[PDB]
């Protein structure tokens, strides 16, 4: 009597993830005339008006 | 790996008025005029450095 056996197994797993985000903003103002307190109030870069 | 660099700088200049200095017939201060008169014609590092 002769008995023989063979077994084999393999597992492969690869994972990849990429994330890229970009955002910019720019502002240019050019005001001529009446450089008093009110135009400094209007010189507020965040609010548009 | 995550990297987030953000530099948001603002340089704002509001000019009140401009000034322009005259080029000819400039009247110097009396102190500066005295200091100039107090300088010898011979090269002297001490007095010139003081001035």
Shortest CA gap A30–chain B (Å): 10
Please state, in angstroms and rounded to a whole number, the distance separating the CA atoms of residues B50 and B39: 10
What approach was used to elucidate this structure? Answer: cryo-EM
Asked if B12 lies within 8 A of A45 by C-beta distance, the reply is yes
Residue of B nearest to A20 (CA): B2
Spatial CA neighbour of A26 closest among B4, B6, B9:
B9
Given resolution (angstroms): 5.6
Q: How far is CA B20 from the centre of its chain?
A: 14
Interface residue of B4, B8, B14 to substitute, partner A, most A CBs within 10 Å: B14
Residue A31: closest C-alpha in chain B = B14
Contact of B5 with B12, CB cutoff 8 Å = no
Angstrom distance (rounded) from CA A41 to CA A43: 5
Token reading at A28: 């240019």
């Amino acid at each position: 009597g002769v008995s023989v056996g063979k077994c084999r197994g393999i597992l492969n797993e690869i994972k990849d993830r990429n994330k890229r985000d970009t955002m910019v903003e720019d502002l240019v103002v050019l005001v001529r005339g009446g450089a008093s307190e009110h135009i400094t109030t209007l010189a507020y870069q965040e609010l548009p008006t | 790996n995550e990297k987030k660099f953000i530099f948001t700088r603002i340089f704002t200049k509001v000019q009140t008025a401009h000034f322009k200095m005259r080029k000819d017939d400039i009247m110097l201060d009396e102190g500066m005029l005295q200091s100039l008169m107090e300088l010898p014609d011979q090269y002297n590092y001490g007095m010139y450095a003081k001035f």
